[PDB]
RNA sequence: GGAGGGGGCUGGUGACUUUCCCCUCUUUAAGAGGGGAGGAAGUUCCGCCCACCCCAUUUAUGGGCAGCGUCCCCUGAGAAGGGGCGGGAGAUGCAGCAGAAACGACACGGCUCCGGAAGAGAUGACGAUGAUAGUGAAAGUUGAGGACUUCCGGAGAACCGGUGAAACGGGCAUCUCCCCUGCCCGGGGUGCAAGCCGGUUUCGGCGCUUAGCCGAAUGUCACCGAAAUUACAGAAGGCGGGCUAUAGCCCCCAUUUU
RNA sequence: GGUGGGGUUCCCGAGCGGCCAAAGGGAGCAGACUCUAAAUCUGCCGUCAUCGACUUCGAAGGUUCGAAUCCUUCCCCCACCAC
């Protein structure tokens, strides 16, 4: 007999998904403080459950203030790859600026191009 | 999915709710969704447009799931939902 | 007006019995009078009076306490509750995974130089997963008959870390010292079931009480009042601080409400 | 009234803030073994009962990235005291 198929960490991951989806759904209405409360509760349950953030909702939030970042409204997203490949998220509310360095994927593409050169 | 057994640990925010019994007479008859949740308090926005502050331990709640309607005391919902999903065991005896 | 939280108080008089107790008193042995559990007695976290044992007789050195109200942090229906008190140095830890890197800085990749290999002179390599290209190069403006390149290894002035709660740099907690301010000087250890005496195993007396039992006394009823024996709940050497649980009224604060 | 302590699996008992880390022993079940049984060994060991994963460390609150563990409160269990 199997009554409990869903464990504590599974319901924790479901609460992560539901809370951050409701954060996105409520952040577009005009209440950024309610969305900050959702991100704060999701971050508190992430540090409490010792579970990692999903890669979908990972870069959509700010670590300093906690505002859910709408790209374009209160978040400026620019891709610069002259010196090193990076995608920069800029919070318009407080001013915290984060980025996405892509050096090792460029290294993998570079090794694939070296293999295509040496085979040819 | 949200189950009637794990509704003691599922998140209450984002679910329609009505209360059926309470000691406050004017509390009976409200219908709305859950927005904010603290240790023994729900902040419920009515369909009419009024925000109400409902204590949990004085009333019983009927949560509307995907088709389901589950009646749970707020005495079972004691604690912040953070600590409630940590682990909260509540055993109630209405003698 | 209704659940709840905090603060204040918890007895007096009259009658019965020494056969509820203790003390005092006279008197044909029995009576009369007075007093008799509280805010916590519980919890034992502590300190002092009182004792013994050691060092010492010292405010020279040194030891102990405090920085209150205020403020900060955390959780509640935001009234209320709990914790803390200044600054520096040294050491440890922030597991596992991830990340270049987990507590002092660094090795590492983008940047510059050198050596080797491969392609190439109106050709070809590369390039919207960004080209010659600039800025204090976190960041932002730029966006292509743009265009001379790419890799590996070694050495270096400045800038940068897809991760995680927390990062070329500032944090957190613990421990020990020196930098302050004010007060007080015997320092430790055990504790009244300590300690002392008749006795010399075992017992009785002191510590012991404007209540003072120890095989653990403080009884019953009515009433003024409305603070009342109703809830938590009971002394044991005494006093002061803090915690825990609530009966009745008073005061203050909050949600629903109108 | 007083001091020094302990509460973890059915019972006796360990455990650095960290992957059921939960040492374990005895017990139950199953395997193995034996003509049968004892002893030895192996897995479940609380549950699904193959790997593996989740819950319980007396109870609550709080700190923390995270509690058997660190702090506070509520408790109980020991040991010995009249001379
Ligand atoms: Zn911001």
Author numbering:
A (entry chain H): 2 to 121
B (entry chain F): 1 to 95
What's in the article?
In contrast to bacteria, archaeal and eukaryal nuclear RNase Ps have evolved considerably more complex protein subunits, four to five in archaeal and nine to ten in eukaryal enzymes. By using homologous structure modeling based on the crystal structures of bacterial RPR from Thermotoga maritima, archaeal components from P. horikoshii, and the cryo-EM structures of both yeast and human RNase P complexes, we generated an atomic model of the dimeric MjaRNase P holoenzyme, containing ten protein subunits and two catalytic RPRs.
To further understand how the tRNA substrate is recognized and processed by MjaRNase P, we mixed MjaRNase P with E. coli pre-tRNATyr at a ratio of 1:10 and subjected the mixture to cryo-EM single particle analysis. Notably we obtained the three-dimensional reconstruction of MjaRNase P in complex with the mature form of the tRNATyr substrate at a resolution of 4.3 Å. Although pre-tRNATyr was used in the cryo-EM analysis of the MjaRNase P-tRNATyr complex, the ~4.0-Å resolution at the catalytic center suffices to show that the 5′ leader of tRNA is absent in the structure, indicating that the tRNA molecule in the complex is the mature tRNA product after cleavage. The structure of the MjaRNase P-tRNA complex shows that MjaRNase P adopts the same dimeric conformation as the apo structure with two tRNA substrates bound into each of the two active sites. Superposition analysis revealed that binding of the tRNA substrate only induces a ~8° change in the angle between the two MjaRNase P monomers, suggestive of a rigid dimeric MjaRNase P architecture. Rpp30, Rpp29 and Rpp21 form a continuous highly basic surface that is complementary to the L-shaped tRNA, burying ~890 Å2 interface area between the tRNA and proteins.
